[PDB]
Scaffold this motif. Structure first.
Motif, PDB file in Angstrom:
ATOM      1  N   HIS A  97       0.800  -1.215   0.000  1.00  0.00           N
ATOM      2  CA  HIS A  97       0.000   0.000   0.000  1.00  0.00           C
ATOM      3  C   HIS A  97       0.841   1.277   0.000  1.00  0.00           C
ATOM      4  O   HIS A  97       0.314   2.356  -0.223  1.00  0.00           O
ATOM      5  N   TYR A 113      -2.096   2.183  -3.887  1.00  0.00           N
ATOM      6  CA  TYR A 113      -3.364   2.334  -3.201  1.00  0.00           C
ATOM      7  C   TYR A 113      -4.324   3.208  -4.049  1.00  0.00           C
ATOM      8  O   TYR A 113      -4.468   4.418  -3.794  1.00  0.00           O
ATOM      9  N   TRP A 126      -6.137  -4.389  -1.984  1.00  0.00           N
ATOM     10  CA  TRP A 126      -6.350  -2.970  -1.652  1.00  0.00           C
ATOM     11  C   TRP A 126      -7.816  -2.545  -1.541  1.00  0.00           C
ATOM     12  O   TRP A 126      -8.116  -1.479  -0.967  1.00  0.00           O
ATOM     13  N   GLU A 173     -10.474  -4.287  -0.070  1.00  0.00           N
ATOM     14  CA  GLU A 173     -11.154  -4.665   1.165  1.00  0.00           C
ATOM     15  C   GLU A 173     -10.372  -4.383   2.456  1.00  0.00           C
ATOM     16  O   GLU A 173     -10.810  -3.588   3.286  1.00  0.00           O
ATOM     17  N   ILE A 203     -12.970  -4.744  10.535  1.00  0.00           N
ATOM     18  CA  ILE A 203     -12.252  -5.232   9.375  1.00  0.00           C
ATOM     19  C   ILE A 203     -12.127  -6.742   9.453  1.00  0.00           C
ATOM     20  O   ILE A 203     -11.811  -7.293  10.518  1.00  0.00           O
ATOM     21  N   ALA A 233       2.724   1.630  16.035  1.00  0.00           N
ATOM     22  CA  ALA A 233       3.140   2.301  14.831  1.00  0.00           C
ATOM     23  C   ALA A 233       2.161   3.439  14.544  1.00  0.00           C
ATOM     24  O   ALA A 233       1.157   3.580  15.212  1.00  0.00           O
ATOM     25  N   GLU A 241       1.243   6.753  11.157  1.00  0.00           N
ATOM     26  CA  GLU A 241       1.375   7.115   9.751  1.00  0.00           C
ATOM     27  C   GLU A 241       2.831   7.436   9.425  1.00  0.00           C
ATOM     28  O   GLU A 241       3.494   8.133  10.195  1.00  0.00           O
ATOM     29  N   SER A 264       4.429   2.640   8.071  1.00  0.00           N
ATOM     30  CA  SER A 264       4.019   1.502   7.242  1.00  0.00           C
ATOM     31  C   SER A 264       5.147   1.035   6.353  1.00  0.00           C
ATOM     32  O   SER A 264       5.940   1.843   5.875  1.00  0.00           O
ATOM     33  N   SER A 289       1.505  -2.674   8.513  1.00  0.00           N
ATOM     34  CA  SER A 289       0.464  -2.686   7.492  1.00  0.00           C
ATOM     35  C   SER A 289      -0.663  -1.687   7.764  1.00  0.00           C
ATOM     36  O   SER A 289      -0.856  -0.762   6.998  1.00  0.00           O
ATOM     37  N   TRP A 290      -1.416  -1.853   8.839  1.00  0.00           N
ATOM     38  CA  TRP A 290      -2.469  -0.878   9.141  1.00  0.00           C
ATOM     39  C   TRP A 290      -2.927  -0.859  10.585  1.00  0.00           C
ATOM     40  O   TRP A 290      -2.776  -1.818  11.340  1.00  0.00           O
ATOM     41  N   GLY A 291      -3.522   0.267  10.943  1.00  0.00           N
ATOM     42  CA  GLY A 291      -4.293   0.393  12.159  1.00  0.00           C
ATOM     43  C   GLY A 291      -5.349   1.459  11.956  1.00  0.00           C
ATOM     44  O   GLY A 291      -5.278   2.241  11.015  1.00  0.00           O
ATOM     45  N   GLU A 292      -6.307   1.478  12.861  1.00  0.00           N
ATOM     46  CA  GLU A 292      -7.343   2.489  12.937  1.00  0.00           C
ATOM     47  C   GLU A 292      -6.984   3.472  14.054  1.00  0.00           C
ATOM     48  O   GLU A 292      -7.142   3.200  15.257  1.00  0.00           O
ATOM     49  N   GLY A 293      -6.468   4.612  13.625  1.00  0.00           N
ATOM     50  CA  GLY A 293      -5.764   5.523  14.505  1.00  0.00           C
ATOM     51  C   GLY A 293      -4.415   4.937  14.864  1.00  0.00           C
ATOM     52  O   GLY A 293      -3.930   3.999  14.212  1.00  0.00           O
ATOM     53  N   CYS A 294      -3.816   5.513  15.892  1.00  0.00           N
ATOM     54  CA  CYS A 294      -2.515   5.123  16.389  1.00  0.00           C
ATOM     55  C   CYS A 294      -2.605   5.144  17.897  1.00  0.00           C
ATOM     56  O   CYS A 294      -3.118   6.099  18.473  1.00  0.00           O
ATOM     57  N   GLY A 314      -2.231  -2.577  16.204  1.00  0.00           N
ATOM     58  CA  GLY A 314      -1.652  -2.453  14.869  1.00  0.00           C
ATOM     59  C   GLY A 314      -1.653  -3.796  14.172  1.00  0.00           C
ATOM     60  O   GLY A 314      -1.445  -4.859  14.815  1.00  0.00           O
ATOM     61  N   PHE A 315      -1.840  -3.757  12.858  1.00  0.00           N
ATOM     62  CA  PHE A 315      -1.878  -4.969  12.070  1.00  0.00           C
ATOM     63  C   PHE A 315      -0.674  -5.046  11.179  1.00  0.00           C
ATOM     64  O   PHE A 315      -0.259  -4.045  10.564  1.00  0.00           O
TER      65      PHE A 315
END
Ligand SMILES: COc1cc(C)c(S(=O)(=O)NC[C@@H](O)[C@H](Cc2ccccc2)NCc2cccc(Cl)c2)c(C)c1C
Ligand code: NA
Lengths: 29, 251, 10
Positions: free
Chosen positions: B43, B47, B92, B94, B171, B192, B194, B197, B218-223, B230-231
């Motif tokens: 990503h 993206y 990217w 889903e 998710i 982690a 922004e 990543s 890879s990702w999270g919703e907020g920090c 974190g994912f």
């Protein structure tokens, strides 16, 4: 993989430990 | 990195900065896995929803770095990309399933005290270390809060039980992801954020004293939110693809 | 925001 991978020149190669790697070891119960 | 600390010099010599040519800016982290191959998150390169589709010539990798903004004369090396390879089944649309990409450098980078590759895990290292409660380490130059660091940041975070990861989010979580972070009860924090990543989630094997890259940020919703984690891309699960690209396109 | 890198790299 590579022969020397994951061995850090300023730590493992010189037998120095970083300040928090022990936190990782202590978690591997 | 939120609630981390400054990295030590040479602490994460496989850490790579993904750097946009124009305008000059940090895009993401990445990791050095050989003299010509760099691992990152798909990503960071692709993206579509946000019109991100970098080509080789848009990008540089900066290896050996510690300071975020400074040109580290005599320490860092800056490399151009020969070729980008995005996992053909990177989702990217889903949930960022298989958020992994490889970048082949035009020339080999020289190893130094500050530049050194991380290991990729075998099945047994993964079986042994990818366990809830076991801590890995995440590094990066990303945001300090959901400002920006002067230097590379580091945080150690425990792997979390899979039902807890799943129940933390709406998710759909796949077997190519794991999550990490402390629980609200646990009294320590960190995550982690922004810009982090594509950087590595590493673990030091207690068996052979080597650092293995188990995850990719890879990702999270907020920090660093309570009840969120974190994912990370699960690197061993995608290792066949990694070897396939390198065997085929490496020299 | 970033220190300019050498021109060769661009
Ligand atoms: C396509 O799937 C997703 C797309 C986006 C765009 C987001 S998000 O809500 O925007 N959050 C991700 C974003 O904050 C970044 C990663 C990212 C950036 C650009 C495009 C796609 C993803 N998260 C960085 C990060 C923060 C905290 C912890 C960790 Cl491990 C990573 C999420 C969760 C999913 C599942
Ligand atoms: Na969190």
């Amino acid at each position: 993989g590579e022969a020397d991978c994951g061995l850090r020149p300023l730590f493992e190669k010189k037998s120095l430990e970083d300040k928090t790697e022990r936190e990782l070891l202590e978690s591997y119960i | 990195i939120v609630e981390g600390s400054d990295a030590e010099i040479g602490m994460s010599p496989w850490q790579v900065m993904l750097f946009r040519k124009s305008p000059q800016e940090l895009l993401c982290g990445a990791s050095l896995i050989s003299d010509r191959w760099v691992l990152t998150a798909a990503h960071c390169l692709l993206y579509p929803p946000w019109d991100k589709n970098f080509t080789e010539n848009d990008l540089l990798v900066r290896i050996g770095k510690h300071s975020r903004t400074r040109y580290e004369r005599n320490i860092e090396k800056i490399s151009m990309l020969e070729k980008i390879y995005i996992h053909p089944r990177y989702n990217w649309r889903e949930n960022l399933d298989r958020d992994i990409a490889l970048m082949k450098l035009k020339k080999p980078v020289a190893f130094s005290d500050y530049i050194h590759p991380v290991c990729l895990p075998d099945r047994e290292t993964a079986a042994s270390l990818l366990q809830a409660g076991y801590k890995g380490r995440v590094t990066g130059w990303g945001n300090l809060k959901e400002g920006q660091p002067s230097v590379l940041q580091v945080v150690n975070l425990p792997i979390v039980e899979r039902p807890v990861c799943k129940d933390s989010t709406r998710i759909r979580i796949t077997d190519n992801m794991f999550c990490a972070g402390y629980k609200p009860d646990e009294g320590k924090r960190g995550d982690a954020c922004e810009g982090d990543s594509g950087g590595p989630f590493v673990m030091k094997s207690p068996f052979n004293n080597r650092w293995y890259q188990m995850g990719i940020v890879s990702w999270g919703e907020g920090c660093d939110r309570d009840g969120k984690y974190g994912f990370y891309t699960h690197v061993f699960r995608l290792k066949k693809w990694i070897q396939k690209v390198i065997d085929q396109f490496g020299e | 925001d970033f220190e300019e890198i050498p021109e060769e790299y661009l």
